Amino acid sequence: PQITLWKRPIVTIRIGGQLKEALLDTGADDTVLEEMNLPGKWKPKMIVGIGGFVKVRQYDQIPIEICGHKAIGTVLVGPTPANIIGRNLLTQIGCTLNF
Amino acid sequence: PQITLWKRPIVTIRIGGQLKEALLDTGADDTVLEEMNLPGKWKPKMIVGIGGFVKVRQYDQIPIEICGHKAIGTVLVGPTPANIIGRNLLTQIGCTLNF
Numbered sequence: 116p117q118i119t120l121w122k123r124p125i126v127t128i129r130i131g132g133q134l135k136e137a138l139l140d141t142g143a144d145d146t147v148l149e150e151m152n153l154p155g156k157w158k159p160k161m162i163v164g165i166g167g168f169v170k171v172r173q174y175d176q177i178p179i180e181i182c183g184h185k186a187i188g189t190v191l192v193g194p195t196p197a198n199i200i201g202r203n204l205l206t207q208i209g210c211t212l213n214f
Numbered sequence: 215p216q217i218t219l220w221k222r223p224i225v226t227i228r229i230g231g232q233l234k235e236a237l238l239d240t241g242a243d244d245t246v247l248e249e250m251n252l253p254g255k256w257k258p259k260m261i262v263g264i265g266g267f268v269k270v271r272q273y274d275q276i277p278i279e280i281c282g283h284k285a286i287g288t289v290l291v292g293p294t295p296a297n298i299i300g301r302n303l304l305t306q307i308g309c310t311l312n313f
C-alpha cells in the first residue's frame with residue numbers, strides 16, 4: 116500500500132496469533148512492542164530514544180505479519196508508549212519513503 | 215526521491231543558513247533538532263519518547279529545506295540524540311511510505 120503521513124502511520128500487525136496496531140517508524144532501527152508474552156529465550160537489550168535509555172527483552176526469530184506481509188524477525192519487548200515497527204522489518208517488507 | 219530503509223534515512227536539511235543532517239522519522243509527530251539557536255520567540259513544550267518526557271522549545275514559522283524541498287513550519291529544539299524530521303514536515307513535502 117501507500118501510507119500517507121498527515122495522520123500517524125498506524126497499521127494492523129499479527130503476532131502470537133493476535134492482531135494489534137503498530138506505528139510504522141522509519142526513525143527506529145528496531146521493532147519494539149509494548150509488554151507482552153513471546154515464547155522461548157530472550158536476551159536483555161538497551162535501546163536509546165528521546166528521554167534516554169530503555170532496557171528491553173530481545174526475542175529472535177519471531178513470526179510476524181505487517182499489513183498482510185509475513186516475516187520472521189527480531190522483536191524487542193519492553194516499556195514503550197507505542198507498538199513500533201522499525202527498520203529491521205520495514206526493509207524486509209519492501210518499505211520505502213517517497214517524495 | 216525514493217529513500218530505502220536498510221540504512222537510516224538520513225538526509226540533508228537547511229535551516230538558518232546552515233546544512234545539517236537529519237533523520238526522516240515517520241514515528242515522530244513533530245520535528246525536533248538538537249540544541250541550536252533560532253531567531254525569535256519560543257514556547258516550551260513537552261514531548262514523549264520511548265524513555266519518557268522531554269522539555270523542548272517550540273519555534274513557529276521557521277524557514278527550512280528538506281532534501282531540496284522548501285517549507286516554513288514548527289521546529290522544536292531540545293536534547294535529542296538525533297536531528298529528526300517528523301510528520302509535520304514530512305507531510306508538507308509530500309512524503310509517503312510505500313510497499
Ligand SMILES: CC(C)CN(C[C@@H](O)[C@H](Cc1ccccc1)NC(=O)O[C@H]1CCOC1)S(=O)(=O)c1ccc(N)cc1
Binds near residue numbers: 243245
Ligand atoms: C528518537 C528516535 C531516533 C528513535 N525513536 C523512534 C522515534 O520515531 C520515536 C518513536 C516513538 C513513538 C511513540 C512513543 C515513543 C517513541 N518517536 C519519538 O521520539 O517521538 C518524538 C519525536 C518528535 O515528536 C515526538 S525511538 O522510539 O526512541 C526508538 C529507538 C530505537 C528503537 N529500536 C526503537 C525505537
